[PDB]
Amino acid sequence: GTAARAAAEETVNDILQGAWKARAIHVAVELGVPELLQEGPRTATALAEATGAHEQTLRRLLRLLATVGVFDDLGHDDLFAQNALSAVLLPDPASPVATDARFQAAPWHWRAWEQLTHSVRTGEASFDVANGTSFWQLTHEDPKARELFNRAMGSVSLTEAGQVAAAYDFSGAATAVDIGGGRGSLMAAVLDAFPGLRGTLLERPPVAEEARELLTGRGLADRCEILPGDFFETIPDGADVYLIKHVLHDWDDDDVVRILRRIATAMKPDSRLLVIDNLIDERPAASTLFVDLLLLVLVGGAERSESEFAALLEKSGLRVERSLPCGAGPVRIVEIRRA
Amino acid sequence: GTAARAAAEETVNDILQGAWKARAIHVAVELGVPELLQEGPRTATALAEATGAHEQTLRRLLRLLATVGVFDDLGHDDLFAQNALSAVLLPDPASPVATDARFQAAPWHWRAWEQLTHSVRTGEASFDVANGTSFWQLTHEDPKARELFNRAMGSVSLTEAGQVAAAYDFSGAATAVDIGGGRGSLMAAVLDAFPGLRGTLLERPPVAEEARELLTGRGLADRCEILPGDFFETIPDGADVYLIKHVLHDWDDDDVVRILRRIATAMKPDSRLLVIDNLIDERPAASTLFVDLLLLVLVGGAERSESEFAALLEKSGLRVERSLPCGAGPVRIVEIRRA
Ligand SMILES: Nc1ncnc2c1ncn2[C@@H]1O[C@H](CSCC[C@H](N)C(=O)O)[C@@H](O)[C@H]1O
Numbered sequence: 136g137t138a139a140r141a142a143a144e145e146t147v148n149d150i151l152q153g154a155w156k157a158r159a160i161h162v163a164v165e166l167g168v169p170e171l172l173q174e175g176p177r178t179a180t181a182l183a184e185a186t187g188a189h190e191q192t193l194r195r196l197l198r199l200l201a202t203v204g205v206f207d208d209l210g211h212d213d214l215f216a217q218n219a220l221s222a223v224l225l226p227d228p229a230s231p232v233a234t235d236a237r238f239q240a241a242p243w244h245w246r247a248w249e250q251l252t253h254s255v256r257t258g259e260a261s262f263d264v265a266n267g268t269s270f271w272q273l274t275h276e277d278p279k280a281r282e283l284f285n286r287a288m289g290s291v292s293l294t295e296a297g298q299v300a301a302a303y304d305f306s307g308a309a310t311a312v313d314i315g316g317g318r319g320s321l322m323a324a325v326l327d328a329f330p331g332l333r334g335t336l337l338e339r340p341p342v343a344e345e346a347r348e349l350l351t352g353r354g355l356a357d358r359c360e361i362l363p364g365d366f367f368e369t370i371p372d373g374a375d376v377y378l379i380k381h382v383l384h385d386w387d388d389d390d391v392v393r394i395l396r397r398i399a400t401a402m403k404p405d406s407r408l409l410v411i412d413n414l415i416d417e418r419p420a421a422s423t424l425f426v427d428l429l430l431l432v433l434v435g436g437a438e439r440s441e442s443e444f445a446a447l448l449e450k451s452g453l454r455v456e457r458s459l460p461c462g463a464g465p466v467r468i469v470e471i472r473r474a
Numbered sequence: 475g476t477a478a479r480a481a482a483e484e485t486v487n488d489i490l491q492g493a494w495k496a497r498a499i500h501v502a503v504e505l506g507v508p509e510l511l512q513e514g515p516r517t518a519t520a521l522a523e524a525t526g527a528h529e530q531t532l533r534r535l536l537r538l539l540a541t542v543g544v545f546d547d548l549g550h551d552d553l554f555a556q557n558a559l560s561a562v563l564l565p566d567p568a569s570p571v572a573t574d575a576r577f578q579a580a581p582w583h584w585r586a587w588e589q590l591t592h593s594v595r596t597g598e599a600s601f602d603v604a605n606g607t608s609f610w611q612l613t614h615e616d617p618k619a620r621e622l623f624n625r626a627m628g629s630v631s632l633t634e635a636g637q638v639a640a641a642y643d644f645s646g647a648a649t650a651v652d653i654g655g656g657r658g659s660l661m662a663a664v665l666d667a668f669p670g671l672r673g674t675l676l677e678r679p680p681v682a683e684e685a686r687e688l689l690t691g692r693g694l695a696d697r698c699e700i701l702p703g704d705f706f707e708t709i710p711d712g713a714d715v716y717l718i719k720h721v722l723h724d725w726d727d728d729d730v731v732r733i734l735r736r737i738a739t740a741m742k743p744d745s746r747l748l749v750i751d752n753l754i755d756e757r758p759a760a761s762t763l764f765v766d767l768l769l770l771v772l773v774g775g776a777e778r779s780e781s782e783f784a785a786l787l788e789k790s791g792l793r794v795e796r797s798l799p800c801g802a803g804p805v806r807i808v809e810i811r812r813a
């Protein structure tokens with residue numbers, strides 16, 4: 136079995152080139168190739184002209200992609216066509232993969248990964264040293280970066296909103312506050328399914344406006360307050376239910392604790408906090424561990440297990456009431472009460 | 475087809491996460507984790523201690539890596555062990571994957587990929603716009619980068635050198651010249667297999683000295699002259715056989731014709747020229763196209779088909795006598811004569 140090593144090497148080589156395979160997709164969606172292929176096959180020449188790409192070089196890109204299953208290389212007349220895998224890339228506010236692909240295409244996203252070694256050495260986000268500014272700082276100043284992230288978070292949220300509204304009985308609640316609720320699709324799904332609920336959305340000012348736009352167009356503009364705020368400082372008191380989705384994993388233990396104590400002090404004895412986020416269990420999917428690493432690279436965050444998160448709550452005067460699933464992924468809804 | 479669309483989204487999301495898998499490996503070889511595991515399992519704690527890493531973060535990397543098949547997570551006592559995939563990553567100047575993994579670890583390598591879009595719009599190197607300098611200039615000034623690259627090329631060449639010396643009959647030549655012959659392993663293999671042959675190695679000056687160190691160390695100084703120079707200005711004339719291996723694919727059409735015409739004028743009507751390079755045929759393998767894309771990004775190069783080489787040789791006053799298999803990959807030996 137001398138050539139057992141030959142396969143070892145081949146496997147590791149294919150992993151390395153995987154980096155390039157991903158940048159090629161990033162470039163394909165940055166140029167907007169997949170939407171040009173919706174009305175039938177097109178030549179790489181037409182594709183280059185329409186995207187502002189160098190004709191021969193785009194042809195190399197597509198030939199390559201087709202070889203690894205993205206797009207179909209028709210094999211004549213310079214024609215390429217949509218296929219199962221490239222169709223996944225059609226831009227759509229509601230597509231996780233398509234919006235994330237576009238978000239990853241951004242240079243500063245890739246540059247963060249350039250400095251992965253810094254994260255591994257310090258436990259800190261590499262985004263800061265690679266790009267000369269925090270991820271939150273950048274999404275505050277740069278409307279394009281802000282849009283790429285919001286769209287990528289927005290699509291995941293959309294498919295999660297309806298499922299959370301169905302896993303938890305909000306009847307009995309007069310008021311729900313959504314802490315850092317992005318574009319408000321979770322709030323919007325819950326209000327719709329509970330006509331008597333009043334809601335409040337908390338977000339950074341520019342995102343708050345995005346949420347106002349989404350809620351308004353959902354005919355819920357009168358049922359939900361928008362508060363351009365900050366959840367290290369401001370949170371509404373006396374609400375019946377608080378929600379926080381894909382926020383806490385963005386932060387280190389101390390910061391998760393600072394946020395939790397802020398929520399605790401605003402809760403009524405009978406109030407409930409729903410922490411909605413990815414949990415690390417005993418059998419974490421590879422896919423789940425990668426996101427945990429993304430979180431370290433972009434914001435220095437981390438995915439947490441059942442007990443890691445329990446340890447943090449007990450630091451913040453809170454207790455786990457219930458823990459229920461939310462869509463055969465790693466996403467769980469953790470129902471929490473004041474201690 | 476709900477279930478069909480889910481599976482497509484997942485397949486594509488894997489491709490995206492693949493960039494992160496590659497960088498995780500780059501970090502592991504940069505820190506030196508495989509070397510620390512040759513004498514049995516170690517804890518993430520000790521591995522961190524030895525490498526200067528942040529313990530909890532190194533643990534996450536290792537766990538992620540082990541989930542994708544690189545290293546074993548022993549599952550007890552915070553222990554990780556070498557395995558078949560991670561052994562491949564052990565620093566060995568004769569290992570293509572090991573040296574290439576280390577080459578790719580460099581931030582300037584990763585950043586060239588950051589700007590793939592530029593290359594795809596222009597057909598030119600993205601390396602220059604990403605790094606503020608050209609690849610050849612970087613490897614010229616900066617010894618670390620020179621060494622990373624020369625090692626990655628060096629290991630590939632060792633393999634190939636042998637395959638070439640045994641693929642071609644040099645028994646009728648008195649003098650051989652290797653143009654841009656790197657560290658000199660090809661010349662070394664050919665001189666070894668042909669005791670009567672004498673040789674000349676032409677390379678950029680700093681690289682030439684490395685060739686001198688290799689060739690002398692292997693007892694061939696007496697039969698190979700080292701010529702520091704530039705193949706755009708100088709090709710020594712009158713030799714029996716010229717060799718140019720993995721050089722032409724680095725250069726655009728104009729520049730390849732410059733090189734070829736100068737080689738043409740140095741040849742006696744009896745001389746042969748061996749162009750040794752990756753040839754694109756009908757239906758190339760993904761791996762061959764990835765390297766094509768690397769050439770694009772790093773130096774604005776491209777792999778070519780034989781017919782495409784033929785046209786260039788045509789504009790240069792040369793012609794193809796025959797092409798022979800070699801090493802059993804895309805590499806091929808194309809024997810040329812003056813026309
Ligand atoms: N100090 C702060 N105050 C308020 N919101 C913040 C904040 N820091 C980060 N955020 C918000 O936290 C959100 C994390 S993304 C999660 C968005 C939404 N909850 C969803 O599940 O889709 C971002 O939209 C960001 O705008």
Ligand SMILES: Nc1ncnc2c1ncn2[C@@H]1O[C@H](CSCC[C@H](N)C(=O)O)[C@@H](O)[C@H]1O
Nearest residue numbers: 631654655656677678681703704705719720
């Ligand atoms: N202008 C120039 N003059 C001479 N050599 C050059 C050059 N530009 C690049 N090179 C050399 O071209 C080589 C291509 S790498 C291939 C090295 C060797 N032929 C092998 O197959 O292993 C590099 O070593 C680089 O130093």
Ligand SMILES: COC1=C(C)C(=O)C2=C(C1=O)[C@@H](COC(N)=O)[C@@]1(OC)[C@H]3N[C@H]3CN21
Nearest residue numbers: 235287288291381382385413426429433434
């Ligand atoms: C708010 O913190 C998060 C940040 C900063 C991300 O970049 C990010 C996520 C986060 O939660 C994931 C959402 O998706 C889940 N958590 O399922 C996501 O990774 C899958 C998907 N939006 C893409 C990007 N990426």
Ligand SMILES: COC1=C(C)C(=O)C2=C(C1=O)[C@@H](COC(N)=O)[C@@]1(OC)[C@H]3N[C@H]3CN21
Nearest residue numbers: 574626627630720721724752765768772773
């Ligand atoms: C000379 O031009 C080349 C440059 C500049 C490279 O970075 C590079 C190669 C080249 O040919 C390949 C060589 O080896 C082949 N051609 O198989 C290589 O990738 C396969 C393997 N040395 C690693 C790096 N990488």
